[PDB]
Design a protein around this ligand. Structure first.
Ligand SMILES: [Zn+2]
Ligand SMILES: [Zn+2]
Ligand SMILES: [Zn+2]
Ligand SMILES: [Zn+2]
Lengths: 212, 69, 70, 848, 208, 144, 100
């Protein structure tokens, strides 16, 4: 409403203002990265979550000022002037072709559902408080160490395949805490200063709260 | 010198547009057929099967941009 | 000083046709002179607006063609 | 005038031929063609051969930077007759070959006529005595190889094959082997096939087979893929009429078989029948070469043929234990080692008839003198102990631990220490451990050298006996303490070292009374005037501090460390090293033992335990700074290290920036970080580069905890990267590198993109340290902010008009490309099609 | 062979960026296309200079360093400055005497204040976007204002008090604008007491 | 009293007119002598050095004229006549308050300079050729 | 090393022989020469580990004691996935010091 989010096939999201008094279509923001966006979805009045051909998922939130009132020659770097900024990049591994903000279970809360091209279906759920975010960050930062992937591919350097990862905790590595031998679970859990049933309770609470 | 003999695609101070773009196209083709899902995406856009797309890509890596200049 | 004007491109003649075939004893001073009151008025007699598109054109017949392109 | 007219150095009176034209001045006109150049390149050589090291490095840089201008002609006809003087030195010869290789990267493809003139000087470096002269010889013949190509080498070194002199022929063979290494075997393998089958004079065949032998002994397992086509060259030998050709063909077969282990045995099948006929049919030195060849072949063989060839070569080996000549003694001493390392030779056969004439004829005195007959004999005796047993060999040589030759006791102790290191001490009964305990005590007591072989033998033996050494600790320790009182000074050093070897065996033998006996004894032997005595005292006392607790030892640390703080002012490297090892262990594990002002008054002492030329001293003292800080707090030791930053000496400022990073991470870093950020306001150069170097080390040390402190120090590096003095920029670029790899994957990609804007204009610097610091920072930011961002920066400078910007931007693009080649696929720009070629990647462009 | 700046400006879809040297390249169309590609950054300014990128900062004197505010609120600057000015009076007699008899606890500030200032009061600095490279003059080009507002600095120099009363506060060109019209070049400028209400549109003026 | 010596932000020294950097204390004061500093000093003596100066106050004889000072001067033995100059009170050795008048200053080499206060703005002309006379033989000096 | 710029690495294909470091070199990263955060073992090629060359220091050529390692900043930059990091030549240092 009153804004347009034009997805280029190569560069990125280009914000466009439409005016009522005139009929102009004024570009007033674009993004610094190239993306090859496939589809996209609006989350707030500012932010646009998008997905690309190569596998990633980005979220581009406008800066807090970014005034739309631009009436009409130099650009900033051969483009627009208010460059938007990115507040997550994450690698999924498949070309994500559908993003949607919804609530999959009544009694739950909103969660960005993505449906990939190789059949998979995932969600990206926000964190409520910093204690949850810091706990899950330390859980997956332990699981990159104790439980490396099978092919030898480094997990941080898989999720940071094209662009480096930002503000996303991989819950598929976290939900392999329930799949180790119990000596490893006891080691990680005493490193977390909890007990492994409490860690598995905390680890499935996010899934049952947000989704299936 | 020794890089461009060993690690192909690097390039030097006198690398023309054609050599840089032919290394660009060859690395693009090997990453298309390397990733499964870019190959999925290029198979949906035609009705070709995956082996038809891989043969079409693999036969193009010899001279992808055209004859040299 | 001899080396100070041999390093700096000075007293090595370059000519800007649009300001009445004015002369310039330095390349740095030349590309500086393009954004000046004299050269801007010399394009203002042509009616060509002062932008950065017309940066290093000297001959009028190229400048009027370039402004015809826009 | 008898010395030339300036501050040119002193001419020795036999250097007045090569620098003869320096005593007369030219006043450069009326005699100045290129002659005024060559006299100049005369002068530089005198500044290199005879000068002070500033004159050396000045003339050496001035002769490398103008080697294009001087040309190989004058330069080599001056350098080469200087090396052909009969009155050189070792260091003058070394500086001359340094001068020759330092112009071989500049005169690429211009030393084409001067290859043979280089080789007739450089070829005797390969047969030289000292190892590093051999390495310089091999290195510059490999450089001459890669610089002169291949066909020039073949045209030069072919007349040196049928040459009359044997020394030029042998050195030509070794030169051919090193050019074969630097240019690959199959480049010149047709030439070896040519020269080895050439039949006009046998010396050409002998030379080519020598070439094959030195190729095999030079490059070990890189002869393996070309092995079959190379042994086919040699196998046309062994049937030549000359004994020298057959002998060197057998030696070449031995070198190839030692090189290809264990492989290629199918490629050796056409060699075994002339080898068998040769060892059966005749005696001589051809027997010795054939015997070395079969002794290297049969470990490459399958067990049936290995057993058959071993059991009918032992007859000749027993026949040649009586042999007088020394090279066949060395050869059968080698052949026994491989002929019993396999299955097939049963242990009773060996203990009945292999080893008794072995010990009769090989454990002599003269075999211990020659080093290549020392080490071969002891390594063969160890293998005979591997097969037969430990006790059967040890009981046969244990009575000679009490001999009167020091080299023979050294040989026997080295044999026994290698056996009991390999096998163990379970075999030795109680009737023989007293024999060897008295043997090693007498052998330790009566050595005249400073060798550590008796010490390591004692340590390995009493480690192997374990708990069975208990009724010898009264015998040993009473031997030790009376050893510690001597008019001699080194034998006290022999005693205390022994304690540091036998401290580990008394706790595992329930002997802590006697450790409590000799800790308090060693407490008063550390007022010793001699430094190397007191260093071994401190080593023994360190071993006792380890093997007991720190808090349950009898000269207790309440009054052991106060005695150690004046030891720490001793400038000897041994005493410093052992004293700060002990002070570091006391400082982290026992810091509740002294005054916490004593720690202050020794952390002023560890500022001069830097400037210590040993680099283990300097890296133990910074750990000691960290431990002292963890004891008494990171606010007094930090002010000490920040006062130390204005001292004018590196090796005293970089090793305190290390210490500031150590106290930063051993406490939490905020405890140091405002004070360390405040010292950037001190308007001196060394303290500002000190806080930048210490931030580099701090971020490298803390790693993933840099997410908290990056916003604090980004306004510091943004000020350092704007500063004129380029050491600020190289150290701030190092900080950007370590910080960028420390916050990877944490979402701090905005601060690094800020700092990249200031790092990136330092791309065009040409000082090598700052260019490698900025380029390490760029390839360390590539992973932090992405290859996309670094490709956006590296773009549009790739095709800039100037070569000076084009090559720097292309090498940063090469670093990005080989860093992450896959990730660049999404980030490439769109490049439209011209007339003849198509450039749009159309596959990415279409959409479902 | 090297066609001049004229024809190169004719050929390129964006002749804004093609400069004096790009005709002397080895591929001008590609170079000016990459110069006009979207989010790239340009080559540093000192590739053609003669002064080694910062050896023109010779004679200018600069402040030492401004510590960030959260670190300055730990008192470390005041204690450390007092300690340096105390140590600058010591002779070598007392400098080597307090090397063996040290009085410690000279600063000994606390750890809760430092852990607060690095974790509670941490401040985001003023960063910059990825295009904004650095050149030598950069921090002294700081000059990089609107119709209808006047700064406090300009109002002191003009003697024009900021107040809301659109007629006594106005700029002294008010009477002339009532006579001659509003700005020819600001058609939508609204001035309080002219074409905007006097007490309502008190921002001096506004484009609306 | 050097006005071009600067110490920069990192404890080195700089000549400000030459714009040159110097590492240590002794490398600036060996640059103040040298072809870079002297020629830049010229771009930005002997008779002054050898002035004999006893500093002896001569005897003046001021007198109100109408249509003049009479200085008795002992022997100079040189060709150069005594010289006058009008000087302002703005620059002085003590610089104290009340500066704001002019002095007619008289000098000749071996002996002391003499000053005469003028509070009126204009009454005469303190010029050399127009209005001075030198009775060198009797050694009385004139100026009106 | 990075201090001596004339030293070259082997850079051939890394085999299974684990590289070793001497007593004078203990703790060093092979590429960086930094002492902190070792993460990845060193695998030297087969020509650089043959016969008398076994168990020998990667940097020195002296007798090895401990296992060699890449640091974490070599691991995450993937400097462990180029070749055999065995420093081949001894050049212009520890040779004139032998000659002095
Ligand atoms: Zn000066
Ligand atoms: Zn490393
Ligand atoms: Zn190797
Ligand atoms: Zn080493």
């Amino acid at each position: 409403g009153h804004r347009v989010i034009v997805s280029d096939v190569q560069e990125s999201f280009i914000w466009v203002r439409y005016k009522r008094n005139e009929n102009q279509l004024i570009i007033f923001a674009d993004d610094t990265y190239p993306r090859w966006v496939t589809t996209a979805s609006l989350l707030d009045y500012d932010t646009v979550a998008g997905a690309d051909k190569f596998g990633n998922i980005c979220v581009v939130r406008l800066p807090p000022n970014t005034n739309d009132e631009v009436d009409e020659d130099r650009g900033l770097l051969n483009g627009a002037s208010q460059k938007a900024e990115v507040i997550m990049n994450y690698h999924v591994g498949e070309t994500v072709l559908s993003l949607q903000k919804t609530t999959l279970i009544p009694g739950g809360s909103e969660s960005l559902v993505y449906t990939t091209l190789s059949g998979g279906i995932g969600i990206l759920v926000p964190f409520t408080s910093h204690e949850d975010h810091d706990f899950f960050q330390h859980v997956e930062m332990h699981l990159r160490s104790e439980h490396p992937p099978l092919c030898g591919r480094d997990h941080l350097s898989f999720r940071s395949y094209y662009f480096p990862v930002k503000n996303v905790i991989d819950g598929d590595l976290c939900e392999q805490f329930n799949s180790m031998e119990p000596n490893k679970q006891k080691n990680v859990s005493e490193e977390l200063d909890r007990t492994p049933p409490e860690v598995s309770k905390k680890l499935e609470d996010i899934r049952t709260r947000y989704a299936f | 010198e020794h890089l461009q003999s060993k690690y192909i695609g690097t390039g030097h101070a006198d690398t023309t547009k054609w050599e840089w773009l032919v290394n660009q196209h060859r690395d693009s083709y090997c990453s298309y057929m390397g990733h499964f899902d870019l190959l999925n995406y290029f198979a949906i856009a035609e009705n070709e099967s995956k082996a038809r797309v891989r043969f079409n890509l693999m036969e193009k890596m010899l001279q992808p941009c055209g004859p040299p200049a | 000083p001899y080396w100070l004007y041999k390093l700096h491109g000075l007293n090595i003649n370059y000519n800007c046709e649009i300001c009445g075939n004015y002369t310039y004893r330095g390349p740095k001073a030349f590309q500086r002179h393009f954004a000046e009151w004299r050269h801007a008025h010399g394009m203002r007699c042509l009616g060509i607006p002062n932008t950065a598109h017309f940066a290093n054109v000297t001959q009028i017949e190229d400048a009027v063609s370039l402004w015809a392109k826009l | 005038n008898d010395q030339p007219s300036g501050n040119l150095p002193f001419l020795k009176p036999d250097d007045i031929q090569y620098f003869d034209k320096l005593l007369v001045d030219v006043d450069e006109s009326t005699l100045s063609p290129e002659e005024q150049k060559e006299r100049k390149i005369m002068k530089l050589l005198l500044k290199i051969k005879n000068g002070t090291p500033p004159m050396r490095k000045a003339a050496l840089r001035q002769i490398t930077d103008k080697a294009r201008e001087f040309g190989a002609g004058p330069l080599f006809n001056q350098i080469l007759p200087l090396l052909m003087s009969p009155t050189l030195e070792d260091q003058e010869r070394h500086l001359l070959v340094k001068v020759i290789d330092r112009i071989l990267y500049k005169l690429d493809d211009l030393v084409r006529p001067y290859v043979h003139k280089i080789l007739v000087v450089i070829e005797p470096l390969l047969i030289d005595e000292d190892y590093y002269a051999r390495v310089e010889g091999r290195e510059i013949i490999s450089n001459l190889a890669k610089a002169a190509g291949l066909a020039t080498m073949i045209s030069t070194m072919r007349p040196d094959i049928d040459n009359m002199d044997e020394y030029v022929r042998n050195t030509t063979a070794r030169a051919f082997a090193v050019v074969a290494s630097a240019l690959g075997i199959p480049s010149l393998l047709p030439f070896l096939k040519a020269v080895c089958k050439s039949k006009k004079s046998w010396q050409a065949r002998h030379t080519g087979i020598k070439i094959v032998q030195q190729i095999a002994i030079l490059m070990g397992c890189a002869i393996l893929p070309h092995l079959r086509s190379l042994v086919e060259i040699i196998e046309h030998g062994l049937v030549d009429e000359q004994q020298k050709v057959r002998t060197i063909s057998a030696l070449a077969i031995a070198a190839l078989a030692e090189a290809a282990t264990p492989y290629g045995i199918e490629s050796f099948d056409s060699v075994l029948k002339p080898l068998w006929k040769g060892i059966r049919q005749h005696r001589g030195k051809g027997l010795a070469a054939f015997l070395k060849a079969i002794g290297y072949l049969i470990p490459l063989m399958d067990a049936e043929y290995a057993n058959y060839y071993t059991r009918e070569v032992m007859l000749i080996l027993i026949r040649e234990f009586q042999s007088p000549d020394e090279e066949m003694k060395k050869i059968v001493l080698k052949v026994v080692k491989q002929c019993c390392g396999t299955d097939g030779v049963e242990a009773n056969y060996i203990k009945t008839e292999i080893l008794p004439p072995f010990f009769k004829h090989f454990w002599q005195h003269r075999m211990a003198l020659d080093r290549r007959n020392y080490r071969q004999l002891v390594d063969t005796t160890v293998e005979l102990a591997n097969k037969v047993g430990a006790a059967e060999i040890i009981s046969r040589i244990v009575d000679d631990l009490k001999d009167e030759a020091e080299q023979y006791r050294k040989m026997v102790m080295e044999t026994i220490e290698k056996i009991m290191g390999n096998l163990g001490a379970a075999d030795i009964d109680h009737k023989l451990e007293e024999q060897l305990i008295d043997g090693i005590l007498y052998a330790f007591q009566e050595q005249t050298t400073e060798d550590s072989v008796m010490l390591n033998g004692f340590g390995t033996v009493v480690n192997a006996l374990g708990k069975r050494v208990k009724p010898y600790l009264p015998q040993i320790c009473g031997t030790v303490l009376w050893r510690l009182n001597n008019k001699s000074a080194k034998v006290r050093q022999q005693a205390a070292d022994l304690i540091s070897r036998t401290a580990v065996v008394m706790k595992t033998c329930q002997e802590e009374k006697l450790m409590g006996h000799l800790g308090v004894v060693l407490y008063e032997y550390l007022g010793e005037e001699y430094p190397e005595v007191l260093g071994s005292i401190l080593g023994a006392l360190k071993a006792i501090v380890n093997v007991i607790g720190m808090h349950k030892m009898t000269p207790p640390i309440k009054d052991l460390l106060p005695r150690l703080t004046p030891i720490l002012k001793n400038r000897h490297e041994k005493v410093q090293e052992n004293c700060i090892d002990l002070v570091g262990r006391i400082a982290d594990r026992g810091a509740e033992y002294v005054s916490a002002r004593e720690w202050m008054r020794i952390c002023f002492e560890l500022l001069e335990l830097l400037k210590a030329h040993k680099k283990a001293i300097r890296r133990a003292t910074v750990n000691t700074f960290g431990y002292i800080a963890k004891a008494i707090g990171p606010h007094d030791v930090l002010a000490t290290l920040l006062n130390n930053l204005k001292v004018q000496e590196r090796q005293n400022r970089v090793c305190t920036t290390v210490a500031i990073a150590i106290v930063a991470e051993t406490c939490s870093p905020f405890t140091v970080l405002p004070a360390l950020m405040n010292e950037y306001r001190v308007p001196e150069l060394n303290v500002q580069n000190g806080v930048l170097k210490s931030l580099s080390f701090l971020f490298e040390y803390i790693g993933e905890m840099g997410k908290d402190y990056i916003y604090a120090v980004t306004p510091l590096l943004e000020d350092a990267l704007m500063d004129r003095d380029l050491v600020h920029r190289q150290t701030a670029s190092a900080v950007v590198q370590h910080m960028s790899l420390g916050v990877y994957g944490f979402g701090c990609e905005d601060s690094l993109n800020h700092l990249l804007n200031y790092v990136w204009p330092n791309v065009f610097e040409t000082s090598p340290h700052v260019i490698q610091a900025v380029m390490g920072a760029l390839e360390g930011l590539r992973v932090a902010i992405g290859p996309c961002r670094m490709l956006q920066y590296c773009l549009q400078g790739l095709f800039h008009p100037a070569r000076k910007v084009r090559d720097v931007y292309w090498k940063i693009y090469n670093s990005i490309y080989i860093g992450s080649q896959d990730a660049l696929i999404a980030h490439y720009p769109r490049i439209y099609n011209d007339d003849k070629n198509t450039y749009i990647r159309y596959e990415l462009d279409y959409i479902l | 062979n090297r066609f001049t700046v004229a024809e190169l400006k004719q050929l390129v879809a964006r002749p804004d960026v093609v400069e004096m040297h790009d005709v002397t390249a080895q591929d001008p169309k590609l170079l000016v296309h990459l110069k006009a590609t979207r989010n790239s950054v340009p080559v540093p300014r000192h590739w053609c200079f003669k002064r080694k990128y910062l050896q023109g900062k010779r004679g200018i004197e600069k402040p030492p360093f401004e510590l960030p505010d959260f670190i300055k609120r730990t008192g470390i600057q005041e204690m450390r400055e007092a300690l340096q000015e105390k140590e600058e009076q010591k002779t070598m007699k007392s400098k080597m005497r307090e090397k063996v008899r040290p009085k410690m606890g000279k600063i000994d500030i606390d750890y809760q204040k430092l852990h607060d200032a690095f974790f509670k009061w941490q401040t985001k600095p003023k960063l910059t976007i990825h295009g904004d490279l650095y050149y030598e003059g950069k921090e002294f080009e700081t000059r990089l204002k609107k119709p209808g507002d006047l700064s406090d600095e300009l109002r002191i120099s003009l003697g024009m008090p900021v107040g809301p009363n659109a007629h006594k506060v106005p700029p002294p060109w008010l009477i002339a604008m009532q006579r001659y019209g509003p700005p020819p070049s600001y058609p939508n400028l609204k001035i309080p007491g002219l074409n905007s209400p006097i007490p309502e549109s008190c921002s001096f003026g506004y484009h609306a | 009293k050097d006005p071009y010596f600067m110490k920069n932000h990192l404890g080195s020294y700089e000549c400000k007119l030459c714009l040159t950097l110097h590492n240590n204390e002794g490398s600036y004061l060996a640059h103040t002598q040298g072809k870079k500093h002297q020629t830049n000093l010229a771009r930005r003596v002997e008779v002054k050095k050898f002035v004999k100066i006893g500093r002896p106050g001569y005897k003046v004889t001021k007198q109100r004229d109408s249509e003049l000072f009479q200085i008795d001067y002992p022997e100079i033995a040189e060709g150069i006549m005594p010289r006058h100059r009008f000087m302002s009170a703005y620059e002085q050795r003590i610089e104290p308050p009340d500066r704001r008048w002019q002095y007619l200053l008289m000098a000749a080499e071996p002996y002391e300079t003499i000053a005469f206060k003028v509070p009126s703005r204009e009454i005469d002309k303190a010029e050399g050729k127009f209005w001075t006379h030198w009775n060198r033989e009797t050694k009385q000096f004139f100026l009106q | 090393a990075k201090h001596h710029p004339d030293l070259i690495f082997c850079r051939k294909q890394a085999g299974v022989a684990i590289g070793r470091l001497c007593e004078k070199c203990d703790g060093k990263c092979v590429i960086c020469d930094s002492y902190v955060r070792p993460c990845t073992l060193v695998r030297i090629c087969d020509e650089c580990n043959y016969g008398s060359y076994q168990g020998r220091c990667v940097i020195c050529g002296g007798p090895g004691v401990s296992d060699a390692y890449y640091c974490k900043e070599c691991t995450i930059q993937e400097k462990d996935r180029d070749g055999c990091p065995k420093i081949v030549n001894l050049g212009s240092s520890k040779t004139d010091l032998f000659y002095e």
